[PDB]
Amino acid sequence: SMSVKKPKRDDSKDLALCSMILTEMETHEDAWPFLLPVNLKLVPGYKKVIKKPMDFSTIREKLSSGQYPNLETFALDVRLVFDNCETFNEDDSDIGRAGHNMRKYFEKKWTDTFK
């Protein structure tokens, strides 16, 4: 509360570490469904159904331009990528499986880096 603060967690390396995680996600072989925004002209249903599209390129641009105020808003956008994928794709499809694999990969790196 006012003039009463928890001890300062060092957040000075957060930007660099989120960039590293994002690099690892970008270079994973199963990243291909997520590298670029879904083409809303060419994919029926996507625009109406997925209220907040997100992809790795868009996360990378947001990261590089100071549009994440803290590491939790970064993790929210990454998880959005996988939540969208599950909304639109059957679990038993290549893209559906890609999304489960990538979410697992991400959550481990996240825990190991920060928790």
What domain range is 38 assigned to? 1-115
Please give the method by which this entry was determined: X-ray
- 58 exposed, middle or buried (CB, 10 Å; 0-12, 13-18, 19+)? middle
Chain centre distance of CA 43: 21
Resolution of the coordinates in A? 1.8
Q: Give the C-alpha separation, 31 to 104, whole Å.
A: 12
Q: Give the C-alpha separation, 91 to 55, whole Å.
A: 19
Tokens 């469904």 correspond to what residue?
33
What does the DSSP 8-state code read for residue 51?
S
Count: domains in the chain: 1
What Cα–Cα distance (Å) separates residue 35 from each residue in 14, 46, 57?
Answer: 22, 16, 6
Helices in 1-115 by DSSP H: which ranges?
A: 14-26, 46-49, 56-64, 71-88, 94-114
CATH of the domain at 89: 1.20.920.10
What Cα–Cα distance (Å) separates residue 65 from each residue in 19, 20, 59, 71, 85?
Answer: 12, 16, 10, 14, 25
